[PDB]
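Dear colleagues,

For the upcoming journal club I promised to circulate an example of a predicted protein-ligand complex. I picked one with 3RF because it came up in last month's discussion. The inputs are reproduced below in full, followed by the predicted structure.
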Amino acid sequence: TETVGKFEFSRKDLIGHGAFAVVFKGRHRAAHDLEVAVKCINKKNLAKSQTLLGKEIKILKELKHENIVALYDFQEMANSVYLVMEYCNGGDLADYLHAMRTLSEDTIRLFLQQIAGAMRLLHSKGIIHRDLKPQNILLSNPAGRRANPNSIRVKIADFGFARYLQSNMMAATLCGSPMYMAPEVIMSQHYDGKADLWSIGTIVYQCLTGKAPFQASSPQDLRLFYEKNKTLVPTIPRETSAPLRQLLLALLQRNHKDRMDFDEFFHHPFLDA
Ligand SMILES: Nc1ccc(Nc2nc(Nc3cc(C4CC4)[nH]n3)c3ccccc3n2)cc1
């Protein structure tokens, strides 16, 4: 049994194993019914794991929001780093959208309204996430067993690649997940917060179809694909409502100049609200 502050955990219940973090379920030492997820270093990738978990602490200690997985406490030392996080009891969006055989437009609206709320906070704080994908959107239902799925709340996780970006500057670090990366990122160009909006477009597209909007055999294929094709148009099911289709096309603009910006996203009628 390992302890971090007022919390405890063990390697008994593995929530997830990643290259740069291992996550175990734990609990409050006094209030046992308070569940937590504890992120720990992956010692097989010690340096990078330590770096990413440290970065995540720096960003999350500044981000309190329902739709961002909460950081309850943390413990950073020279040779170990732990994050004690809110436990999300619904698994991830990658699994859910697949189990449901894609999601209804009403459910997509419900989830996207929540993601938009979290993104409003990120944008106001000058923070870009850079690894948005359905695997990093977690579900949690505050109600009891067998509760209505309309009560599902979604929360953005895994801020290890996040950074502050000053509003007159651009970022250029290649990071993220290739299938969800904006074209300008995977082409090693400069980018800003609109890269996250592309990623959000890909999340919405996957919720609708089950698949990524642009299929290439590989990341190099995907990159060559963006380089060779100046106008990208994703295959969207014909029965999709016109406003959801328009939102998707606006977010999935190849050229970031033409891509939907934050104000346009926040106030898009599909999200009304
Ligand atoms: N870094 C990381 C992110 C997501 C996962 N996957 C995950 N995560 C679950 N809950 C989490 C996780 C967290 C903090 C975010 C790590 N809080 N709550 C979960 C709950 C029920 C069933 C499957 C689940 N799968 C693993 C590691």
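Two points we might discuss: The longest helix spans residues 105-125. The CA atoms of residues 130 and 175 lie 7 Å apart.

See you all on Thursday,
B. R.
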